[PDB]
């Protein structure tokens, strides 16, 4: 019964927005990645630094599970060295990233008629994010040389933005649930095997 809670992340009910992604650290348990492949519901299942076929035979110090929701057009930006609104302003992975990137379509769950305004994404930011940096600031972005004084208007836009997922949208704009597993290896003993 010492199994790592995989269902608590993938089979979760709510998924955070990409600008305020949710991270759950997993340690001291048995990680069975074989049941992950036995689902076939994932559109993207790519790993970096390790081979996904040779998984379930490794050990790591800590395992961080970052879960959020973006659209299919932006799933390509969940990779080291990528650019775009998601990779620069919302969730940036390091170049020396050693983990796996899992994603699957959730149109029947994260999309309602008229627009699912529950999910947001940062659109404007004065600079890009660092690896594993989260920016939840709602400061009014100054688009031009005109100041804003915390009030929206001309050249002053709200930093966040909603997706408005609809079931009738294109496949690129439909919502996709992403779970980025980070495998940390330090000089400390490992706690996640199995």
């Amino acid at each position: 019964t010492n199994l790592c809670p995989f269902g608590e992340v993938f089979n979760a009910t709510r998924f955070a927005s990409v600008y305020a992604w949710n991270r759950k650290r997993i340690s001291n348990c048995v990680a069975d990645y074989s049941v992950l492949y036995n689902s076939a519901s994932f559109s993207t299942f790519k790993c970096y630094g390790v081979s996904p076929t040779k998984l379930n035979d490794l050990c790591f110090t800590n395992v961080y599970a970052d879960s959020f929701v973006i659209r299919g057009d932006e799933v390509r930006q969940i990779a080291p060295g990528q650019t775009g609104k998601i990779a620069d302003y919302n969730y940036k992975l390091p170049d020396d990233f050693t983990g796996c990137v899992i994603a699957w379509n959730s149109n029947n769950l994260d999309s309602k008629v008229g627009g699912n305004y529950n999910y947001l994404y940062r659109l404007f930011r004065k600079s890009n994010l660092k690896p594993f940096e989260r920016d939840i600031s709602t400061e009014i972005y100054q688009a031009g040389s005109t100041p804003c004084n915390g009030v929206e208007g001309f050249n002053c836009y709200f930093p966040l933005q909603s997706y408005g997922f609809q079931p009738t949208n294109g496949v690129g704009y439909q919502p996709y649930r992403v779970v980025v597993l980070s495998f940390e290896l330090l000089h400390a003993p490992a706690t996640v095997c199995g």
Epitope: G115, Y117, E152, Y157, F158, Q161, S162, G164
Partner: nanobody, 118 residues
Framework: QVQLVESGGGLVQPGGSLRLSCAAS????????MNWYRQVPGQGLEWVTS???????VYADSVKGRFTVSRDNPKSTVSLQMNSLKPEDTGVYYC????????????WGQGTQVTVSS
Amino acid sequence: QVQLVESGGGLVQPGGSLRLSCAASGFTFKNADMNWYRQVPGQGLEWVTSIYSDGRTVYADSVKGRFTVSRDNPKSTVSLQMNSLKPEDTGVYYCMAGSKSGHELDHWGQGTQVTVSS
């Protein structure tokens, strides 16, 4: 210039009632979706409720039966009747209008602080 003017924050004891208002100017209000979000200092925005142009109202399960959204289309006003408040409802509330026009952006309000504690 699209503007959203928020109003109706303030301090309230656990169990009080509030009525936040959103003043919309610069677009067709009768054909726009209006949404409410609250942000506790330290966390991201949480979707509170929404009311579409169809008049359909959708509420989060955390405020089910306690909040209510109004839509005064001639006045172009979004009213959020916040009733039976709890300390967990403390935070800055935002009303935003968005979408329907493609190359547009969701316009947001300036926010109103709401505090509930004793």
